[PDB]
Amino acid sequence: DPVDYQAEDATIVQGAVESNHAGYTGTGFVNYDNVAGSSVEWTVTVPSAGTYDVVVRYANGTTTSRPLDFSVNGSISASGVAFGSTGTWPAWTTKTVRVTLAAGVNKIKAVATTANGGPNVDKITL
Numbered sequence: 001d002p003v004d005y006q007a008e009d010a011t012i013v014q015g016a017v018e019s020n021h022a023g024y025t026g027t028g029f030v031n032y033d034n035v036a037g038s039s040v041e042w043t044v045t046v047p048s049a050g051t052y053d054v055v056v057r058y059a060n061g062t063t064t065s066r067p068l069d070f071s072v073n074g075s076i077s078a079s080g081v082a083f084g085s086t087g088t089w090p091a092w093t094t095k096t097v098r099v100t101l102a103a104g105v106n107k108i109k110a111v112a113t114t115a116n117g118g119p120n121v122d123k124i125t126l
């Protein structure tokens, strides 16, 4: 079965664990710093090699899409994945990103590519 990997439990670069908007799961969420290069990197375990539907649960209380690049350590997995508006910060939704993984432990990194940083990210599920 898919497992929830909480953002606030992952490796956060230029970001903060926060909990001041309603509707996150786990103990909070990650607010990426509003800077290019802000990132979160999750450590996941999957039973078989192949391409997974990585469900990214996020919010973006602005009218400006906030794109992320996904990689599995070192290697580009998805490039310029746009995270559009959700109207308000507590209004979480999801986006599925295809990421190819090996059997066992993998690290998935999502890095902000624009000066606005990333959307707020609650977790990934896969």
Ligand SMILES: O=C(O)C1=C[C@H](O)[C@@H](O)[C@@H](O[C@@H]2[C@H](O)[C@@H](O)[C@H](O)O[C@@H]2C(=O)O)O1
Binding pocket: 021, 031, 032, 034, 089, 117, 118, 119, 120
């Ligand atoms: O990414 C944002 O633009 C953002 C994340 C927060 O969830 C929002 O409440 C809002 O926060 C602003 C700053 O990003 C944040 O670092 C500061 O501590 O508070 C700001 C605010 O407007 O409250 O935007």
Ligand SMILES: [Ca+2]
Binding pocket: 031, 032, 033, 034, 116, 117, 118
């Ligand atoms: Ca931010």
Ligand SMILES: [Ca+2]
Binding pocket: 006, 007, 008, 024, 025, 026, 027, 028, 029, 121, 122, 123
């Ligand atoms: Ca969370």
